[PDB]
Amino acid sequence: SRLYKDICSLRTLYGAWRKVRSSAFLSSSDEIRREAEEFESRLPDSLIEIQHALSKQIFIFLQQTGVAQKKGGKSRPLVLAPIPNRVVQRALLDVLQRRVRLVKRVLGTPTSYGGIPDKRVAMAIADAREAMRTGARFHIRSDIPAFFTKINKDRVLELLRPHLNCEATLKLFEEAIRTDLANIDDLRRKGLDEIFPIGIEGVAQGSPLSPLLANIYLADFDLAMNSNGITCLRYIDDFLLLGASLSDVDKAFNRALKELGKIGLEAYDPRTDKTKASRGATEIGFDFLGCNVSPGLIQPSEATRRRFRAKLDAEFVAASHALRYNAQYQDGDGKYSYSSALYRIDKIILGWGKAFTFCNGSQCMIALDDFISNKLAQLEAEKIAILANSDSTVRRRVLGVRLLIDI
Amino acid sequence: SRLYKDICSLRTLYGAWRKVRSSAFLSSSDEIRREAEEFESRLPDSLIEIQHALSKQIFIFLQQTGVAQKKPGGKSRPLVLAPIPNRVVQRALLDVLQRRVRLVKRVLGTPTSYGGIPDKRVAMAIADAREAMRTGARFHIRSDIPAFFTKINKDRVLELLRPHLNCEATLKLFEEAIRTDLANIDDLRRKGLDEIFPIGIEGVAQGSPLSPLLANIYLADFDLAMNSNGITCLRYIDDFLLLGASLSDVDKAFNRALKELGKIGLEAYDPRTDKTKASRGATEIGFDFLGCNVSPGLIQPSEATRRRFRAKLDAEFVAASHALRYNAQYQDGDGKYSYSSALYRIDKIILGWGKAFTFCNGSQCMIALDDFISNKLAQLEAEKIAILANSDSTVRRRVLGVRLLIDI
DNA sequence: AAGCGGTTAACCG
DNA sequence: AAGCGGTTAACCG
Ligand SMILES: Nc1ccn([C@H]2C[C@H](O)[C@@H](COP(=O)(O)OP(=O)(O)OP(=O)(O)O)O2)c(=O)n1
Ligand SMILES: Nc1ccn([C@H]2C[C@H](O)[C@@H](COP(=O)(O)OP(=O)(O)OP(=O)(O)O)O2)c(=O)n1
Ligand SMILES: [Mn+2]
Ligand SMILES: [Mn+2]
Question: Most exposed of A263, A367, A400, B42 (fewest Cβ within 10 Å)?
Fold first, then answer.
């Protein structure tokens, strides 16, 4: 089977591993990094082993580890797997997306944008604002509660059996999407087992296949909803319905509830969940994918700016505490030294402002820059007060220039 | 042959490629890493091509590029930049020669040799020297070989390793790897820089992984001869220390060293004529070795090493002051030299340097260097307070180094 | 247009 | 103790 042969090819497996290591080497978890160093060493052989197993069809997905990601909703069920699992999983995604028509068709879908190669949030935001200015005068925006968890692996499998034409790739794909948690007993003891995809409901959050799986799951939804003069733009779970009449979108959301109902999914009702979903005249402006889409103006959603000001606020108080602490105290992290804090704050402004460069949030950005400018001025004066009466050593640990005598 | 089989191992080759990739991917050179990313793409095939060729013995080293590199003094480092396949096969050769060749493992093994050897550091040599002093070595001569890589003779190196390798194919690969062929030779000849590069049998390429091992193999006869008759010779690459009970014993040793070096075509800086490259005198008073000042009681960074550090730090502060003035009036700033970014980098320079001399015990000069830092620092604050007193918010953000969202 | 062997950003050849 | 897809470090799911 040429499809299966691609999966066992060393070009694919090394391509996949390149993708996996790019993450592992940066992992906060030392074990993941070191497991990757152990895989990077013996690299020709460490992938040939997998290639060998895959070829003789005796590859074994190792038991995973289910952890709880700090989360509004229930702690995200993060399924962390060994490197060979992640490598074989990333391999499957690469071969599926270049060789399977249904996959490329699902990637092709014009109204789907999340987790699709060559597709970005900005493109959706553009299409949305294009629908207004073509007769979109009202909206509903909603998302699927616990989407992955409610995804059914039996429906996933049944949709994929036709377009696979390789019973071996079917077995591999089947084992790829199972979750066998090795810490299951500890997880039962905390009463946490039930949120993980240990049964047929759910896909592993943390597998590379799951976003494709999700997008395949809503293939039917995407088609049904783009009809009746109602335009639906979906990024992952989030869907924006755009229409001429409030009545029209209201009915469409009702059709959506039935459409997601067939496949086990609900959708936050805008009137019921104003903080999770939205409804109204597209003119008032609406929040979508972190932007506020007004037809005159487009900018990051207030919540995104709020988050950003809160992260900035935290850093600045962190610095102030440190400036007093470093004076009169020998030990400091030095992360919060004036030099380090400003350096972090500068790169935070870079990283965030870099993603919103498409947005024109200038009235808001100037306020965010006004917030930063004021915060910067305060700390500067705060430190000069302390520096005004300070010996060289104190200023050194305050400013963040290490002392050689203490190394 | 097991030796050659080893070199044609894709695990051997990939190991070599990993080390080459780590260097090329951080390379300042536009050309060099572009070449490396392309090799990382197509990686599976990129290396089998080399493996096929190595197994077939059809492998061809490609033409290299010679670069005279400005060095302190009028001296130039003859850089030989090679294509990625050259570089991979050469690191492959090094990795195999150092794990399978008995002579090679013995040369790395020698106790008195420390440069470019795995599991070996400058401190281990400084420690060995102090012990020799503790057991009665009260006088020393320290010297260096001029242009050592340039004067090594490939034919002697081949003669030394030919009995040990036991494979004609390994020997042929080694000869091709040692050899230098330059694409840029006509341009160098017009320059007059052609002679510096190892185009001839004399010399070993700088920028080749093999060349540091070759030098250790070349000086192995010197290492045994020097460590005799009450004299301990400790060598890191070219640099050598002769340790003895009496000045006469060290003086006699230097003459012996020149003779051992002379047979192999090498020479040493004279301790009386050149203060910078050789020293002579009593170990009880201090002497410099490998950037350390080795006193029987105290070890510290050497005075030259501290001057470099003081200059590197001074440069950083000069740049910071200039940018302080520039980032106020203009917007074309580099930002690397903004107050926040400047102070942050200086801190990490101070980290890395103090980390290098943790094996030293002298605090007096560390304290004086700390004082100099605090002086330049407080000056820079004076310069920042001044500029910012007459400043709007936009200038304050450009000076301090907290970029504006508007300018993204 | 910037390379190599090595060490706990840096250091030594 | 920390994962995934996608995009010009971050953002969005
Ligand atoms: N860091 C990650 C990783 C994966 N996903 C995936 C899994 C979710 O099922 C899907 C939908 O995105 P949501 O943020 O809406 O996630 P949930 O549907 O789980 O949350 P909620 O119940 O709050 O809608 O996106 C995600 O959102 N965020
Ligand atoms: N950055 C460096 C420093 C040194 N070396 C190698 C090649 C040199 O020939 C050898 C000896 O180091 P020296 O610094 O003593 O250099 P030279 O012997 O070439 O010059 P000099 O006459 O100044 O001693 O170490 C190197 O490859 N790269
Ligand atoms: Mn959701
Ligand atoms: Mn020299």
Answer: B42
